[PDB]
Every structure is written in structure tokens, then in C-alpha cells.
Short mmCIF file of C-alpha atoms in Angstrom, two decimals:
data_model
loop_
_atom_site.label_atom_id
_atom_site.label_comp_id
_atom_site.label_asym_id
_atom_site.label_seq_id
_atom_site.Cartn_x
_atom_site.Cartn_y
_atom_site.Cartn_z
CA UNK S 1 -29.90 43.71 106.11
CA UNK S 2 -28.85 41.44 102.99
CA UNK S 3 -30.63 38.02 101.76
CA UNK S 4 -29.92 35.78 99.67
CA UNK S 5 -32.11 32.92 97.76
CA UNK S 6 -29.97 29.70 97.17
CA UNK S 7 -30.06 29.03 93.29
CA UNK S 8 -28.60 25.17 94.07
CA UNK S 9 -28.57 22.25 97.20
CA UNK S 10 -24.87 23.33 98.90
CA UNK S 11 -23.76 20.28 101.01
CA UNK S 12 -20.29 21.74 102.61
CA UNK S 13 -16.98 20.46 101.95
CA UNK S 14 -14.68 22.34 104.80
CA UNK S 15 -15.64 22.76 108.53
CA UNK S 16 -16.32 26.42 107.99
CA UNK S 17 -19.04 25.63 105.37
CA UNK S 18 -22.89 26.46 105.87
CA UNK S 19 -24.58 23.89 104.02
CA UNK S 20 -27.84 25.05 102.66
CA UNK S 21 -30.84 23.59 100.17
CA UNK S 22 -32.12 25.03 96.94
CA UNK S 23 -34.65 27.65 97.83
CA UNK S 24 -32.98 28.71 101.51
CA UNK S 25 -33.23 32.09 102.07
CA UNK S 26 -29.91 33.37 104.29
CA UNK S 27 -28.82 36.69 106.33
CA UNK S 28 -25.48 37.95 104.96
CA UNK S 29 -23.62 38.42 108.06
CA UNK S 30 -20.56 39.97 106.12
CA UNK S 31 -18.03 39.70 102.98
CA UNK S 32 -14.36 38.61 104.04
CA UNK S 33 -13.81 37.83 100.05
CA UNK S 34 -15.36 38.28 96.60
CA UNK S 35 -16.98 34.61 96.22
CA UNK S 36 -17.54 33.79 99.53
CA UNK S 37 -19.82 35.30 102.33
CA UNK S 38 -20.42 35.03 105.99
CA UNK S 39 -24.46 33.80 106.05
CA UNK S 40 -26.85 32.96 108.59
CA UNK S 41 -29.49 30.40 108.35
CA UNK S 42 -33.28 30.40 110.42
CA UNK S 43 -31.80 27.35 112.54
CA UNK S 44 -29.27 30.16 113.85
CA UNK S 45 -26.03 28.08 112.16
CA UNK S 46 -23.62 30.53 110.74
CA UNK S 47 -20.62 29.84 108.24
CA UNK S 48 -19.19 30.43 104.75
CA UNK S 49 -21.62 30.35 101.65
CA UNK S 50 -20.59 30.28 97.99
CA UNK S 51 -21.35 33.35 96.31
CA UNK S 52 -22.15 32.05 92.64
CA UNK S 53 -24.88 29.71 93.88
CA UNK S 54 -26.88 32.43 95.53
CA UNK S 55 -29.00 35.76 94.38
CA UNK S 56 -30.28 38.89 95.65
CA UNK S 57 -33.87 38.39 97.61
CA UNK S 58 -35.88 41.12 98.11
CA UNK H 1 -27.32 29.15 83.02
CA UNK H 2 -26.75 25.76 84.70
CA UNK H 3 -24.80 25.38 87.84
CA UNK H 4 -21.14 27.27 87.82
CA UNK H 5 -18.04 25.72 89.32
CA UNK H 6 -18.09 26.23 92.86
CA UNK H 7 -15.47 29.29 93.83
CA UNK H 8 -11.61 28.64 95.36
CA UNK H 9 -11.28 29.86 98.19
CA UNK H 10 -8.87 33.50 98.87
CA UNK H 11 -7.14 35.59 100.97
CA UNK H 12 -9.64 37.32 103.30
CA UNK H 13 -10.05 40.76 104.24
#
């Protein structure tokens, strides 16, 4: 499995969004496109997450 | 490194 450790607060702009705060740590569910990924958060919501304001957790 | 523009959106695989 793939984490990632929000860099910056992501409020959502389209229905598809997953909002997040600075400091989340999300499941990559899966990579439809370069800068955006499927994520998962602990509440269980899913949706797209902007790639540049995220980095590898391990 | 600040905080870079947030991405357009593309076709999807």
C-alpha cells in the first residue's frame, strides 16, 4: 500500500474532490492521471487528491 | 519551496 503526508490544508473545489488538512496522512487507492490520485482518508471518504501538495510517507 | 499552483485537471486513464 501507498501513503501520502499532505504538505498543505486542501479544501475541494469539484464534487469529486477529497478535501484534506496539512499533516493528513491518505491511502492511495489508484492513479487515473499524473497530478491527480484516487486517496482514501481514516473517516473512510474517498475522492481525487492533488498530487503536488502531497509526499511519500513511509 | 512554498505552495505550487494547484494541477488542471486531464484526460484519465
Amino acid at each position: 500500500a501507498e501513503y501520502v503526508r499532505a504538505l498543505f490544508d486542501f479544501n475541494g473545489n469539484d464534487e469529486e474532490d477529497l478535501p484534506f488538512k496539512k499533516g493528513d496522512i491518505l491511502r492511495i487507492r489508484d492513479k487515473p492521471e499524473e497530478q491527480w490520485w484516487n486517496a482514501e482518508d481514516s473517516e473512510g471518504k474517498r475522492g481525487m487528491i492533488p498530487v503536488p501538495y502531497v509526499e511519500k510517507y513511509r | 519551496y512554498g505552495r505550487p499552483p494547484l494541477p488542471p485537471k486531464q484526460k484519465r486513464k
